Design a protein around this ligand. Structure first.
Ligand SMILES: C[As](C)(=O)[O-]
Ligand SMILES: [Zn+2]
Length: 313
């Protein structure tokens, strides 16, 4: 319950109280729930929405695009990762990541908007940044040596399920780009990532998470402890058992995802992905109505506490 490095209770309740469920849902999630396949108008509109939202935060994040053109099974397609670094001068950062593209389906199909995959992850990152904006701003003004970075990756999904190189367009490109850019102390932007936490497949009822990387299990245990704590504090909804989400062991592994290009370059990863996947995965039923709002807000609360403890907010 109260572990070393945990927020005092009154600090925890104020952090959770800064979250706004209506804002998460309407301001951050709803605008994303459009078809947003790489290169589409909808994808570009979501990119600009992310950029503008992030630039509006009073903490004054450094927000930049990583745009590029890559070969795909459909020919050349443009991709653009959105990279938000709160304090670009800090030595290192906690990096939270997700993908903002939606998987392309055949024409004539019921449109796929990927509510869990990964509109909810994207919206959670925006809500965290906003809810903690005053605290993040003060940490930056105090020149904290560990800042926060948010990555909204493009092109995670295969365009045509056309083999292993038809995937991870944005993350492959960004990891290579970061390895080419000096950082202090660095020596490159890859080494600035103290921990890479990838959110994926979130918002369905009854998710289960396992630790996929022994290297980062301490952070998995922290998330579990936060779940338990929030449960006992009467701060979770529709959560009848003390531990439901963060499970022990590893009955299902990690799957290929946007962490891989980072992992292969030595970055420590925590893969916050439901396994088994949502029932709706990769079907057009992955929509807003099939989300479970209490679970979305429960995850948001867990993550807010994690972020405040990790960064000393
Ligand atoms: C973002 As995925 C787990 O559907 O490849
Ligand atoms: Zn997917």
């Amino acid at each position: 319950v109260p572990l070393i490095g945990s927020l005092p209770e009154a600090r925890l309740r104020r952090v959770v109280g800064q979250l706004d469920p209506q804002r998460l849902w309407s301001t951050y999630l709803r605008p994303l729930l459009v078809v947003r396949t790489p290169g589409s108008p909808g994808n570009l509109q979501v990119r600009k929405f992310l950029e503008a939202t992030l630039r509006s935060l009073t903490a004054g994040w450094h927000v930049e695009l990583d745009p590029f053109t890559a070969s795909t099974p459909l020919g050349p397609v443009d991709f653009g990762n959105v990279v938000a670094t709160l304090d670009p001068r800090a030595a290192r950062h906690l990096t939270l990541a997700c993908h903002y593209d939606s998987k392309l389906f055949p024409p004539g199909s019921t449109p796929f908007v990927g509510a869990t995959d990964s509109a909810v992850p994207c919206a959670l990152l925006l809500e965290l940044a906003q809810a903690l904006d005053l605290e993040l701003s003060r940490a930056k003004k105090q020149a904290a040596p560990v800042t926060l970075q948010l990555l909204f990756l493009d092109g995670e999904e295969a365009l045509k399920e056309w083999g292993p190189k038809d995937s991870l367009y944005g993350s492959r490109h960004l990891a290579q780009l970061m390895e080419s850019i000096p950082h202090s102390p660095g020596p490159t932007r890859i080494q600035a990532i103290e921990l890479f936490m990838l959110l994926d497949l979130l918002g369905a009822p009854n998710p289960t998470f396992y630790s996929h990387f022994p290297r980062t299990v301490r952070w998995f245990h922290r998330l579990r402890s936060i779940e338990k704590r929030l449960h006992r504090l009467n701060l979770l909804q529709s959560h009848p058992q003390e531990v439901m989400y963060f499970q022990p062991g590893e009955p299902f592994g990690s799957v290929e995802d946007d962490h891989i290009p980072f992992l292969r370059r030595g970055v420590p990863v925590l893969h916050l992905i439901s396994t088994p996947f949502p029932a709706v995965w990769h079907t057009p039923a992955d929509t807003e109505v099939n989300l479970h709002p209490p679970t979305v807000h429960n995850l948001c609360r867990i993550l807010a506490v994690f972020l405040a403890e990790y960064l000393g907010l």
